[PDB]
C-alpha cells in the first residue's frame, strides 16, 4: 500500500550547549483528535511530534487509515511509550534527525 514518511531536523549544537542528563536521553509522537483545541472547527487527526526544548508540530491525516500495518515485527515487548513509537519511528541522535513512518 502507501504510507507517509516525515524527516524532522533539529539544532546543530547551537543552543543545546548550555547537558545535565535531564531526560537528555528521544522525540515522541502521538495521534491527537482535533476535537480539542485552544475550539472552532474539527474532525480530523494530527500526528503530533514533540521534543523538550523545541515546539510541538502537527500533520493532518484526512485518510482514515494509511500504513496501519499488521504485526510487522515478531511481537517483542518493550512498550517504550506505545506500539506506534517502537513500531515505526527512528531517532538518529548522532545527527539529530527524527524519521517517522
Amino acid at each position: 500500500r502507501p504510507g507517509y514518511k516525515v524527516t524532522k531536523q533539529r539544532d546543530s549544537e547551537m543552543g543545546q550547549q548550555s547537558d545535565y542528563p535531564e531526560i537528555a536521553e528521544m522525540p515522541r509522537h502521538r495521534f491527537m483528535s482535533a476535537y480539542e483545541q485552544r475550539p472552532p472547527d474539527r474532525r480530523w487527526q494530527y500526528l503530533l511530534m514533540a521534543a523538550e526544548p523545541y515546539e510541538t508540530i502537527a500533520f493532518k491525516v484526512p485518510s482514515r487509515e494509511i500504513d496501519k500495518a499488521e504485526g510487522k515485527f515478531w511481537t517483542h515487548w518493550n512498550r517504550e511509550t506505545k506500539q506506534f513509537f517502537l513500531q515505526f519511528h527512528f531517532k538518529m541522535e548522532k545527527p539529530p534527525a527524527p524519521p517517522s513512518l
Binding site: 487509515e65 496501519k68 500495518a69 499488521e70 504485526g71 510487522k72 511481537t75 515487548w77
Partner: protein, 232 residues
C-alpha cells in the same frame, strides 16, 4: 494478549464466519458479538479469543486490513503463564481493557484462583463487580464480588487459602497482589508499595492497559468502577 478486537464486519458476518476466518491461525476459545436487540443485528464488531497469545499475534499481522465479505476489517489486541483481561467501565463510560500476566510459575495456586475468577469456570467470578477502594498513588482494590466493600469474596478453594510465598515484591505500579487469608480480593498497585512486601502475595503484572489502570486511580471511589467483562 489472547483477545482480539475485530471491527468493520459486514452484516452477513456472524460467529460462524469469524470462527472459519480465524481458525487457520490457531484454536479459538471464545467469540463474542455484541447485539442490538431492537434490530437483532450486530454492531459491526466482535472479540475473538485465541487459546495461545502467539496465535493471536499471527492473526493480527495477517488479518488487520484484510478483506472479509467484501470489505476491510480492523484487527488488534482488545486490551505457561496465563494471560487474562478485564474490561473496565467508569461511571456510565467504557474506559478500556487491562491485560494481565499471572505468575503461575511462582505462585501457581494464587494465579489459578485469579484465572478462574476471570473466566467464571467454577461458577462465580469478577464480572460485574467493582473496585471498591481506590487510593491515588497507592492502589486500586477489587474482587469483593459478594459484599462489595472489602469484607467478602471467596476463592476457588474455599473461603481462604494460604500465602504461597513472597518471592515477587511490590516494586512498582501495575502489579497484581492479594488483599488479605487469601480469598478473591486483590489490588493493582499504582506506585512502588514495598511496605507491603512479605505481607501480601504478588502474583501478576499489567502487560497492556496501564493507562486504563490510571483512569481507575483517577477516581480515588468518586465514580463507580466496574469490571464490565473479563476472561482469559
Amino acid at each position: 494478549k489472547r483477545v482480539l478486537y475485530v471491527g468493520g464486519l459486514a452484516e452477513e458476518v456472524d460467529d460462524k464466519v469469524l470462527h472459519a476466518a480465524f481458525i487457520p491461525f490457531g484454536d479459538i476459545t471464545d467469540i463474542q458479538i455484541p447485539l442490538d436487540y431492537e434490530t437483532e443485528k450486530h454492531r459491526g464488531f466482535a472479540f475473538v479469543e485465541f487459546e495461545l497469545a502467539e496465535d493471536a499475534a499471527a492473526a493480527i499481522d495477517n488479518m488487520n486490513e484484510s478483506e472479509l465479505f467484501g470489505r476491510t476489517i480492523r484487527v488488534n489486541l482488545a486490551k505457561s503463564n496465563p494471560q487474562v483481561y478485564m474490561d473496565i467501565k467508569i461511571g456510565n463510560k467504557p474506559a478500556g481493557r487491562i491485560q494481565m500476566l499471572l505468575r503461575s510459575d511462582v505462585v501457581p495456586m494464587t494465579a489459578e484462583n485469579f484465572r478462574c475468577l476471570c473466566t467464571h469456570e467454577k461458577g462465580f467470578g469478577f464480572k460485574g463487580s467493582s473496585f471498591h477502594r481506590i487510593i491515588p498513588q497507592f492502589m486500586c482494590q477489587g474482587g469483593d464480588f459478594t459484599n462489595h466493600n472489602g469484607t467478602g469474596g471467596k476463592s476457588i478453594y474455599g473461603k481462604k487459602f494460604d500465602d504461597e510465598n513472597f518471592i515477587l515484591k511490590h516494586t512498582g505500579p501495575g502489579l497484581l497482589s492479594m488483599a488479605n487469608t487469601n480469598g478473591s480480593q486483590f489490588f493493582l498497585t499504582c506506585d512502588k508499595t514495598d511496605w507491603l512486601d512479605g505481607k501480601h502475595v504478588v502474583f501478576g503484572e499489567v502487560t497492556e492497559g496501564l493507562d486504563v489502570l490510571r483512569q481507575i486511580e483517577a477516581q480515588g471511589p468518586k465514580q463507580k468502577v466496574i469490571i464490565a467483562d473479563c476472561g482469559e
